[PDB]
Amino acid sequence: WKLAKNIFYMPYWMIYGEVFADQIDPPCGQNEIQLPPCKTGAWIVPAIMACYLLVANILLVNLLIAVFNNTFFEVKSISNQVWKFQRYQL
Amino acid sequence: WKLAKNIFYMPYWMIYGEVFADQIDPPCGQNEIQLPPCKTGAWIVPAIMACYLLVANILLVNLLIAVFNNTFFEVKSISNQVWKFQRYQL
Numbered sequence: 573w574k575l576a577k578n579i580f581y582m583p584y585w586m587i588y589g590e591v592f593a594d595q596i597d598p599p600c601g602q603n604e605i606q607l608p609p610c611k612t613g614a615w616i617v618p619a620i621m622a623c624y625l626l627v628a629n630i631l632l633v634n635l636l637i638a639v640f641n642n643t644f645f646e647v648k649s650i651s652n653q654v655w656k657f658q659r660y661q662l
Numbered sequence: 663w664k665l666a667k668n669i670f671y672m673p674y675w676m677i678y679g680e681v682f683a684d685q686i687d688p689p690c691g692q693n694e695i696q697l698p699p700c701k702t703g704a705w706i707v708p709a710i711m712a713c714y715l716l717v718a719n720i721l722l723v724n725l726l727i728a729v730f731n732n733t734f735f736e737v738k739s740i741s742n743q744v745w746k747f748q749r750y751q752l
């Protein structure tokens with residue numbers, strides 16, 4: 573079950589300004605002490621990290637900003653009128 | 663080819679809240695153990711870092727917020743009508 577935890581753990585905190593910079597692309601397959609060998613296709617992980625961070629943090633958050641902004645006025649008027657209606661129930 | 667990787671590595675993650683604070687301006691050219699000597703013009707790197715972070719994070723992201731916001735209504739109406747058209751194809 574730790575695999576399912578590792579699916580959601582670091583990509584979720586990646587949205588809130590913690591990119592885990594020590595684990596983006598650690599040096600491996602060299603001697604600095606002998607490092608463990610390079611996993612195959614481990615260079616893909618920073619690239620899809622870049623695409624994910626771009627899509628999430630720039631596209632979806634700003635789109636939710638636009639959604640919150642362009643539906644603010646109708647929701648504000650409806651909420652004011654509904655609160656004035658629910659004053660009687662209170 | 664590691665030079666081309668180093669071009670894109672840290673400035674890209676600099677947008678998402680990871681400024682790499684240990685490598686902004688490390689102490690050098692002193693004894694704390696003898697540090698390696700100061701590179702010439704290494705003080706320029708935090709200044710252009712400051713200008714880059716300002717321009718990127720404050721100018722361009724907020725401008726994309728404005729672009730997403732002011733074209734939201736036309737895109738929303740067009741997308742609703744296009745989805746209602748593509749219901750038949752589905």
Ligand SMILES: CC(C)CCC[C@@H](C)[C@H]1CC[C@H]2[C@@H]3CC=C4C[C@@H](OC(=O)CCC(=O)O)CC[C@]4(C)[C@H]3CC[C@]12C
Nearest residue numbers: 573574575576577578579580581582583584585587632
């Ligand atoms: C659909 C949207 C609106 C809500 C989000 C729901 C899911 C994305 C959440 C809710 C329940 C969550 C699960 C609740 C419990 C666990 C057990 C957890 O197990 C461990 O951590 C085992 C311990 C370990 O070995 O570390 C792994 C994550 C997981 C599957 C969670 C994965 C994410 C889930 C499916």
Ligand SMILES: CC(C)CCC[C@@H](C)[C@H]1CC[C@H]2[C@@H]3CC=C4C[C@@H](OC(=O)CCC(=O)O)CC[C@]4(C)[C@H]3CC[C@]12C
Nearest residue numbers: 597598599600614615616618619622626667670671674
């Ligand atoms: C302006 C923005 C919207 C896009 C520009 C950013 C990307 C084009 C950059 C940022 C991070 C970069 C990646 C950072 C690290 C790597 C790992 C690198 O692989 C290795 O170095 C091998 C393994 C190792 O030596 O540790 C291959 C390039 C790649 C995928 C880079 C490809 C280009 C990326 C995706």
Ligand SMILES: CC(C)CCC[C@@H](C)[C@H]1CC[C@H]2[C@@H]3CC=C4C[C@@H](OC(=O)CCC(=O)O)CC[C@]4(C)[C@H]3CC[C@]12C
Nearest residue numbers: 597599615618619622663664665666667668669670671
């Ligand atoms: C134009 C916009 C819309 C898209 C962005 C495209 C480029 C900015 C990307 C796409 C392909 C990328 C290249 C794909 C592969 C590599 C090899 C990579 O090589 C290594 O990492 C060598 C291993 C090492 O020594 O660390 C260095 C980055 C580089 C040149 C990447 C640099 C960034 C590039 C040019």
